[PDB]
Amino acid sequence: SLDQCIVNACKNSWDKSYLAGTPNKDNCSGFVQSVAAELGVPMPRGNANAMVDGLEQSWTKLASGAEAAQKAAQGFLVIAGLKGRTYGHVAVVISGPLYRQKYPMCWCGSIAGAVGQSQGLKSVGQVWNRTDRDRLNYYVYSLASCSLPR
Ligand SMILES: [Cl-]
Ligand SMILES: [Cl-]
């Protein structure tokens, strides 16, 4: 799989604070911003809800979590997102076998603490609850790859 630069960016972004005084581990949107910044990928800005709005507008929408995992394996930046009535959530999809043959692996920060956080060993199906899991949107930046040629 070709996601090593993405994973590296996730690892680096974990300890950064995109927003003053707010660790990215505790801020899903700031985490994703820092990942994109390291990768040089234009990323819609703002809170999780504003990010999903932006991604809907300007990124390529994928059909499934299966496809999300495939695109991440090809070295493309893939964001999983779902708007909330109050606050949304966003995560970076990484390569790896699908959880329950449906849900791709991810990294994400969360204000919720450990229950909403992933350092790559949780799938989106173990961060979002049983109902939200099957309603997630997956967006890919199809314009340029986030991998260096083999
Ligand atoms: Cl938010
Ligand atoms: Cl693509």
Residue numbers in the entry: 3 to 152
Paper text:
Interestingly, native Tse1 crystallized under similar conditions but with a different morphology and with a different crystal packing. Thus, phases for the native crystal form were obtained by molecular replacement using the refined model from the selenomethionine-substituted protein structure and refined to 1.7 Å resolution. In both structures, four molecules per asymmetric unit were found which were virtually identical to each other. The core of the protein is formed by a twisted, five-stranded antiparallel β-sheet in a half-barrel configuration. This half-barrel is shielded by surrounding α-helices. Cys30 is found to be in close proximity to a histidine residue (His91), which is the second highly conserved residue within the N1pC/P60 family. Together, Cys30 and His91 form the catalytic diad commonly found in cysteine proteases. In our crystal structure of Tse1, a water molecule (W2) was found at this position. However, in Tse1 we observed a cysteine residue at this position, which cannot maintain the correct tautomeric form of His91 with a hydrogen bond, demonstrating that the minimal requirement for N1pC/P60 hydrolases is a Cys-His catalytic diad.
Most importantly, the T6SS from the Gram-negative, pathogenic bacterium Pseudomonas aeruginosa was shown to inject at least three different effector molecules (named Tse1, Tse2, and Tse3; Type-6-Secretion-Exported) into the periplasmic space of competing cells. Tse1 was shown to be an amidase that cleaves the γ-D-glutamyl-l-meso-diaminopimelic acid amide bond of crosslinked PG, and Tse3 is a muramidase that cleaves the PG-backbone between the N-acetylmuramic acid and the N-acetylglucosamine moieties. Tse1 adopts the fold of N1pC/P60 papain-like cysteine peptidases, which are widespread among bacteria and of which homologues were identified in eukaryotes, phages, viruses, and archaea.
